[PDB]
């Protein structure tokens with residue numbers, strides 16, 4: 330599923346991400362935009378052999394199981410394929426664990442590099458939330 334901007338913001342809010350660990354909704358929308366372009370089916374292989382999955386590009390070394398990643402811990406206890414669903418619950422549940430791991434949203438390098446410190450509220454501007 331390719332979400333619309335406000336559509337995703339509403340779905341993230343509906344799943345308790347707005348202000349989760351102090352990160353406003355715009356932060357999450359901005360991270361999704363640059364990680365996946367709002368496409369739940371996005372997958373990207375890393376140099377280390379792990380793969381990133383879904384709207385927030387969750388990795389298969391630490392977080393989900395894809396059966397082909399050496400040293401996988403599967404800390405979200407899910408198959409990585411669950412992170413590609415049109416329903417974002419699994420991605421949101423796991424992102425909550427990731428953002429709680431100690432480094433906040435810096436866990437998403439694209440968030441650090443493209444969203445952190447910017448006017449992230451613009452990502453939810455206009456939306457009926």
Ligand SMILES: [Cl-]
Pocket residue numbers: 350351432433434
């Ligand atoms: Cl933080």
Ligand SMILES: [Rb+]
Pocket residue numbers: 402403404405406
């Ligand atoms: Rb596990």
